[PDB]
Amino acid sequence: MVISINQVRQLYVAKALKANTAALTTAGDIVPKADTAKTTLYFQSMSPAGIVASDKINLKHVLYAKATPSEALAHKLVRYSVTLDADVSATPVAGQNYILRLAFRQYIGLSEEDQYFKYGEVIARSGMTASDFYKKMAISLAKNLENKTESTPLVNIYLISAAAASTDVPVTSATKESDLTATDYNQIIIEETEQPWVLGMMPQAFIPFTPQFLTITVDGEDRLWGVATVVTPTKTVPDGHLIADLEYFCMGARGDIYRGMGYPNIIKTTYLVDPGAVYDVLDIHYFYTGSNESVQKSEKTITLVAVDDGSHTAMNALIGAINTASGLTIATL
């Protein structure tokens, strides 16, 4: 995850909090250090290879210091709710083929020009019901979108029973109309699915989609049967994978930039971020200005990430520490 930097960015994992430079026993222990006359601030961190300190922060040249919670970084997955238009017809047409189209916007390549379309076709029948049509439509999408041969996950598709009205019924390529025993299906949800991830090689990305419809003859005129609607998301990709790449990136400023170039002849960097966790982040923006002519600023950032137990204890304790040592006020989250 290559990012933009305001001339530098540096990261320190606050696994623990020790209150003294003496108590820095294990990696990830961090202490905020500021003199009584609050003019400088820095952090003594315990590295896999010994103690280490961060650049000193002039409490006069600090621009913004803010803590961001884990949920702020959790990508809510876009989910649509496609139903058939009660205007055209509240029920399927006897002998029409309903072909739903899912145009995917950012496919393998970065650009919006890298398009990819997936279809779900359902030829309706006399006596067919709406629930039965949603059933078959979702199953067709499953075979096309939730198949196992697809190179990359594309979308999740569900079903909702009016009786439930909130529970989403998964519909996978193994599912079959015998397993979907209901008659009050209202809609078809199509949700965004998390793409893969690799530290330093595949950043956390997504591929978005819009559902498009083809036109059916309802009396004698071509018309669209469906209305695609965006409803509140309910799934979120957690922060663990972003912070990890952030550390994989921001530790090359404090150290080795040749992360792996030179395979036998390299210098491995041990990391302290577990991508299976949820960290709250804290960023401080500050600068250095020189003397009598070197007034040009050098804006800099020092980021601290702490795991969230659900109530932001590690960070709130870290905030109290920095605030009582620096006189700052960083608005505990």
Binding site: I108, E113, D114
Partner: protein, 50 residues
């Protein structure tokens, strides 16, 4: 059995007997090939320059 300098990246690796490919890979003698007559330009109708 120690580091000559401090920027000594490797240590001496040694084994007895039956040598497998992962033996040769763990000593950095097995590498993937690069096909240069093989390249994939993604397919798209690039509508920039329009």
């Amino acid at each position: 059995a120690g580091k000559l300098g401090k920027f000594q990246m490797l240590g001496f690796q040694h084994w007895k007997g039956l040598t497998s490919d992962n033996h040769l890979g763990a000593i950095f003698q097995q590498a993937p090939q690069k096909a240069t007559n093989l390249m994939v330009q993604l397919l798209a109708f690039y509508r920039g320059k329009s």
